[PDB]
Design a protein around this ligand. Structure first.
Ligand code: HEM
Ligand code: HEM
Ligand SMILES: [C-]#N
Ligand SMILES: [C-]#N
Lengths: 156, 156
């Protein structure tokens, strides 16, 4: 299952939306990427079953920054047309988790935390119309879940 | 990992929203459950990797109806306070998929199809304010992903 094939799925998912959704989403994510990373590790480190796989040092020195870079990569893909590069990266991230047996149910819960908080931030974005915010939230759920799908290829 | 423990997670997720979000979501889902099932199997049977696991007869005679019942169960849980019953059901559904080795990445893509189409339907619901529709879409993503999390427990 090659990256140029997986890139079609990413391109097709994003093509359901306009560049306006891509930009609105990428703007809220870049403006809040540290706060989104904070919320992700706040949610995970609180569950003892998730904390099992995480050290405070690993989060502080590596993963907190990596999560910000992951978010930027996901939301840069469609605007910069870097589909093949992004899907290739998602596949490798998935392989990292599968190799150390991160329970897939915690990966999906993590994805949900990011989708929820990004869509909460979009709802409060005064620069978007009701219709534009709505379309952007649908894109955020779609593109995040596409990234999660690529990551979850490693688990089969 | 008992059902009364898993029920806390479902209750907590739904408690982030008001009964207004629960009802708006349950109303759009019940009104469109057959059309949502249609869209789910339209998306899956189109991918040859997913069609591998599905016969037209299995979809026509069992799963199409089961998907409608799954949707009704997910959106009935918070309004009827049947948390323990719903999480118990989700766990068993997950076990069905894990036993016949349904790739988890296809389960997540399926969940995304339902979230996308339900939120598309909510956007067009003239009876909801912009703010109410927004809150309801966030609930739909959260509660669907909670159901998916419960299903994915079987894969670890
Ligand atoms: C949406 C969900 C997730 C995303 C986007 C994500 C992101 C990432 C990324 C980008 C890396 C690679 C870091 C690097 O090598 O630069 C990574 C690795 C890792 N992730 Fe996640 N992750 C997710 C879910 C989880 C969950 C649920 C856990 C644990 C409960 C977890 C624990 C880890 C661990 C332990 C590593 C390896 C760190 C190291 O030892 O190199 N991740 N993750
Ligand atoms: C959100 C995702 C999904 C939901 C909500 C869901 C729902 C269900 C439910 C409720 C059942 C139990 C039916 C019964 O015993 O009454 C079931 C079984 C089954 N599902 Fe799914 N499913 C999902 C994803 C998938 C995917 C991605 C595939 C395949 C590519 C798949 C294929 C099957 C098969 C083959 C069975 C067993 C049917 C039988 O032989 O008894 N499902 N699913
Ligand atoms: C992965 N943090
Ligand atoms: C499962 N259809």
């Amino acid at each position: 299952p090659s990256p140029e094939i997986l890139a079609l799925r990413w391109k097709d998912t994003c093509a359901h939306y306009s560049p306006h959704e891509w930009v609105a989403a990428r703007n809220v994510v870049t403006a809040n990427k540290a706060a989104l990373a904070d919320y992700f590790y706040e949610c995970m480190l609180a569950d003892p079953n998730a904390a099992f796989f995480l050290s405070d040092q690993l989060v502080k020195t590596k993963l907190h920054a990596a999560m910000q870079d992951w978010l930027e990569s996901v939301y840069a893909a469609a605007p910069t047309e870097e589909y093949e590069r992004t899907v290739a990266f998602q596949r490798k991230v998935g392989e990292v988790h599968a190799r150390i047996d991160i329970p897939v149910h915690l990966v999906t819960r993590g994805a949900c935390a990011l989708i929820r908080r990004i869509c909460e931030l979009l709802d409060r974005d005064a620069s978007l119309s009701a219709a534009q915010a709505a379309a952007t939230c649908r894109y955020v759920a779609d593109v995040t879940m596409t990234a999660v799908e690529m990551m979850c290829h490693a688990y089969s």
